[PDB]
C-alpha cells in the first residue's frame, strides 16, 4: 500500500488521496483509474499469492464536481461491491457490479476490443450505430432483441462479431457487459 | 404516566448532526424538548410543567413489524455486533442475556427499515439580482418508509401530559428538525397508552440503560461513573429565537451520555442552561429516562 503502490500507478494520471489496506482513495483520469485498479487487483493477488481479495468502487465525475460528493458517492459504490461478491468491483453505477476478471476480460477484452477494432475499420459505421445498439440493449424489450438482429444484418459488421453481439444480447450477463463495453468505448471514442 | 407518542412523517426530515449536508434518522430528547419549549412559548403556556415534571426519551425507530430501542453498551464477529444500533423490544432481553449471536445481530440490523436517506441539492438565487451568482448547497434528508416512524415515550403527571398533548398537536404543523418551514419535518403524532413499554419499564434489573441523551449533576456524576459503559456525545448548536440576541448566538458546548449507555448507579438528570449572557435562558434537556435490565 505505501511503497509498491507508487510503482504500480507509475505513469498514470492518478493522485492518491490516502492509502492503506483499511481504506484506499485515489482521484485520477477515468480510463487510467480503471486500468490501474485492475493492475492493482492482479498485483495484490500475486503479492498475497491469493487468499487476499480487494473490493473497490469506481465512479466517473466532472472535474468541477465537488470532492466531498465524489468521496461520498464512490464510498457507496465500494459498499455495494463489499456487501456481497466482495472480490467483485462496482463501476460507475449501482447497476454495474462486476468481478475483476469479468471487468478486465469478459468486458474490456472479449467485447470492448472487438467493437473498438470493428468501428475503426468500418467507414460505414460510427458512434451513432453504437448508440442505436445501446438503445435496443437498454430498453430490454424482447422485440429489441429482434430489432438488434435487423440492425446487425443491415450493419454488415463481421459475421463472428454479428453473431457474438447477438449471443451477448440474449444472455443477461453478457448484455450488461456488452452495454458497459459499448459505454466505455463511447467514453473513450468521444472527444 | 408513561405515554407512547408515535410520529408519522409526511415529508422528509433533515435532522442535522453537525452540518446541513448530513442527516440523522432520529433526534435527541433535548432537540424535542427545545421544540416543545418553543411551542409552549408560542402558545403562551407555563414552562414549569415541562421544566419540572416532563421526562422524555430520544425518538426511537419504529416499524410495522417492531419498535426499536437503542443498543445497550454492555460487554458481550465483533463487526456484526458493532454495526447493530437498534434492537426490537422483544429481542432486548435476549440481547441483554447474551443469547444473541452474530448472525442474529446481522438479522436484527437488517430487520429495521426506518427509511432511505438522501441528499437534496438546492440553490440560492438571492445574489443573482445583484450581479452575483447562484449558490449551490446540500440538505441531507431522510425519508421514512410508510409503515416506519419515530416514537418517543413521555412520562409525567396528568397536567404535563395534557400540556404535552396540546404542544404536540401544534408541533406537527410546526415540524421538527432543520429546514422546517422550508419543506421538511411535517409529522402527524398519536399519543396512546402502550402496554408493551409500560410492562418493559416495570423491571428491576441489575443494570440501568439510558433511554434519553442525559447528563448527571456534579454530585450525581461521581457515584454514577464507577463501572459505567457509555458514549459522551457532544451536544452543540446555535440559539434559535427572535429575542435571545440581535444576531445568531451559539449555545455553550455540552456533553451528554448517549442513549443506550449503561450505568450501574441510576442518576436523575437536570435541565441545564447552555445560555451565555442572553435575554433568556436557553434550556438543554439532560434529564434521564432509565430502562432497567438484567445481565
Amino acid at each position: 500500500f505505501k511503497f509498491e503502490l507508487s510503482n504500480i500507478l507509475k505513469g498514470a494520471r492518478i493522485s492518491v488521496i490516502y492509502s492503506g489496506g483499511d481504506d484506499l482513495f485515489l482521484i485520477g483520469a477515468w480510463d487510467d483509474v480503471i486500468s490501474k485498479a485492475l493492475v492493482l487487483r492482479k498485483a495484490f493477488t500475486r503479492f498475497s499469492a491469493g487468499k487476499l481479495t480487494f473490493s473497490a468502487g469506481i465512479g466517473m465525475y466532472p472535474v468541477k464536481y465537488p470532492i466531498s460528493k465524489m468521496a461520498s458517492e464512490t464510498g457507496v459504490l465500494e459498499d455495494l461491491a463489499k456487501r456481497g461478491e466482495k472480490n467483485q468491483v462496482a463501476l460507475w453505477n449501482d447497476s454495474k457490479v462486476f468481478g475483476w476478471s469479468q471487468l478486465e476480460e469478459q468486458i474490456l477484452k472479449e467485447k470492448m476490443i472487438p467493437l473498438q477494432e470493428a468501428l475503426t475499420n468500418s467507414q460505414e459505421h460510427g458512434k451513432s450505430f453504437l448508440y442505436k445498439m445501446l438503445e435496443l440493449l437498454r430498453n430490454e424489450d424482447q422485440i429489441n432483441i429482434a430489432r438488434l438482429a435487423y440492425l446487425l444484418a443491415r450493419s454488415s459488421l463481421s459475421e463472428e462479431l454479428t453473431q457474438s453481439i447477438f449471443a451477448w444480447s440474449q444472455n443477461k450477463q453478457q448484455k450488461v457487459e456488452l452495454i458497459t463495453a459499448i459505454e466505455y468505448l463511447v467514453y473513450q471514442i468521444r472527444e | 404516566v408513561v405515554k407512547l407518542v408515535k410520529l408519522t412523517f409526511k415529508s422528509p426530515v433533515h435532522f442535522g448532526m453537525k452540518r446541513l449536508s448530513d442527516s440523522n434518522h432520529t433526534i435527541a430528547a433535548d432537540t424535542l424538548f427545545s421544540a416543545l419549549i418553543i411551542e409552549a412559548l408560542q402558545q403562551q403556556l407555563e414552562l414549569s410543567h415541562l421544566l419540572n415534571n416532563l421526562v422524555i426519551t430520544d425518538l426511537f425507530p419504529y416499524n410495522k413489524t417492531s419498535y426499536f430501542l437503542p443498543k445497550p453498551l454492555i460487554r458481550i464477529g465483533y463487526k456484526a455486533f458493532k454495526k447493530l444500533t437498534y434492537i426490537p423490544v422483544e429481542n432486548y432481553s435476549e440481547y441483554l442475556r447474551g443469547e444473541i449471536d452474530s448472525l442474529e445481530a446481522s438479522k436484527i440490523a437488517e430487520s429495521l427499515n426506518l427509511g432511505k436517506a438522501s441528499l437534496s441539492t438546492k440553490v440560492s438565487l438571492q445574489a443573482v439580482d445583484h450581479n452575483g451568482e447562484s449558490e449551490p448547497y446540500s440538505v441531507g434528508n431522510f425519508t421514512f418508509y410508510p409503515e416506519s416512524g419515530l416514537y418517543f415515550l413521555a412520562k409525567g403527571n396528568a397536567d404535563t401530559i395534557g400540556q404535552l398533548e396540546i404542544l404536540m398537536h401544534a408541533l406537527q404543523y410546526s415540524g421538527i428538525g432543520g429546514k422546517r418551514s422550508a419543506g421538511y419535518g411535517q409529522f402527524r403524532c398519536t399519543i396512546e397508552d402502550s402496554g408493551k413499554f409500560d410492562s418493559l419499564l416495570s423491571q428491576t434489573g441489575n443494570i440501568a440503560i439510558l433511554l434519553s441523551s442525559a447528563m448527571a449533576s456534579d454530585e450525581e456524576l461521581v457515584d454514577c461513573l464507577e463501572d459505567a459503559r457509555y458514549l459522551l456525545k457532544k451536544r452543540t448548536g446555535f440559539v434559535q429565537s427572535k429575542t435571545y440576541a440581535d444576531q445568531l448566538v451559539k449555545k455553550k458546548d455540552f456533553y451528554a451520555f448517549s442513549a443506550g449507555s449503561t450505568f450501574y448507579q441510576k442518576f436523575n438528570g437536570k435541565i441545564f442552561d447552555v445560555s451565555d449572557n442572553g435575554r433568556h435562558s436557553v434550556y438543554r434537556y439532560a434529564k434521564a429516562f432509565w430502562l432497567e435490565g438484567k445481565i
Binding site: 424482447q142 422485440i143 432483441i145 429482434a146 430489432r147 438482429a149 435487423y150 446487425l152 444484418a153 443491415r154 447477438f166 | -
Partner: protein, 137 residues
C-alpha cells in the same frame, strides 16, 4: 407474448419467430453460388408488402389511447385476413409463410381479444418474422 399455440402445442413468440425462420431456411447452390431460400421461395418484397398492411392498421391502434380495438380497426383486421388469403392464393411461397407462421390464424385471435396489447403483440411477432428473415438471409 404467448400469442397462440401452434399445432403440436408450440407457443407463438419472438423466439418462436426466430425458430420458424430458421426451420424454413435452406441453402441452394444455384449457379454455384450458395443462396439462402426462406419458406420455399419467400422474397423480401412480398414480406415487406405484408408488413406494410400491418403498419397501416398499427399506426391507427398504436396512436389510439383507447385499449379496445376500434370497429374500423377490427374491419382493417378482417381485410388483412382477406389480403393474407389473396397473397397466399397468388403466391405459393406466401401461402407457405402464412401456414408456417400462423399469422392469418393470429389475426382472428386479435379480433377475439379486442385488445390493443394483443394487437401490439401480433404486430411485434410479425416484425420479428421480418427482422429474423433479414438476419438469416
Amino acid at each position: 407474448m404467448e400469442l397462440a399455440k401452434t399445432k403440436t402445442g408450440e407457443m407463438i413468440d419472438l423466439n418462436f419467430a426466430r425458430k420458424v425462420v430458421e426451420e424454413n431456411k435452406r441453402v441452394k447452390d444455384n449457379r454455384g453460388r450458395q443462396e439462402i431460400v426462406l419458406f420455399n421461395g419467400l422474397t423480401t418484397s412480398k414480406l415487406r408488402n405484408l408488413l406494410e398492411l400491418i403498419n397501416h392498421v398499427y399506426t391507427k391502434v398504436y396512436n389510439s389511447d383507447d385499449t379496445t380495438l376500434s370497429e374500423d380497426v377490427r374491419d382493417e383486421l378482417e381485410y388483412l385476413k382477406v389480403k393474407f388469403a389473396y397473397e397466399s392464393g397468388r403466391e405459393p411461397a406466401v401461402r407457405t409463410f402464412i401456414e408456417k407462421t400462423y399469422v392469418d390464424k393470429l389475426v382472428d385471435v386479435v379480433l377475439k381479444k379486442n385488445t390493443k396489447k394483443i394487437f401490439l403483440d401480433y404486430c411485434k411477432y410479425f416484425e420479428a418474422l421480418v427482422a429474423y428473415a433479414k438476419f438469416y438471409r
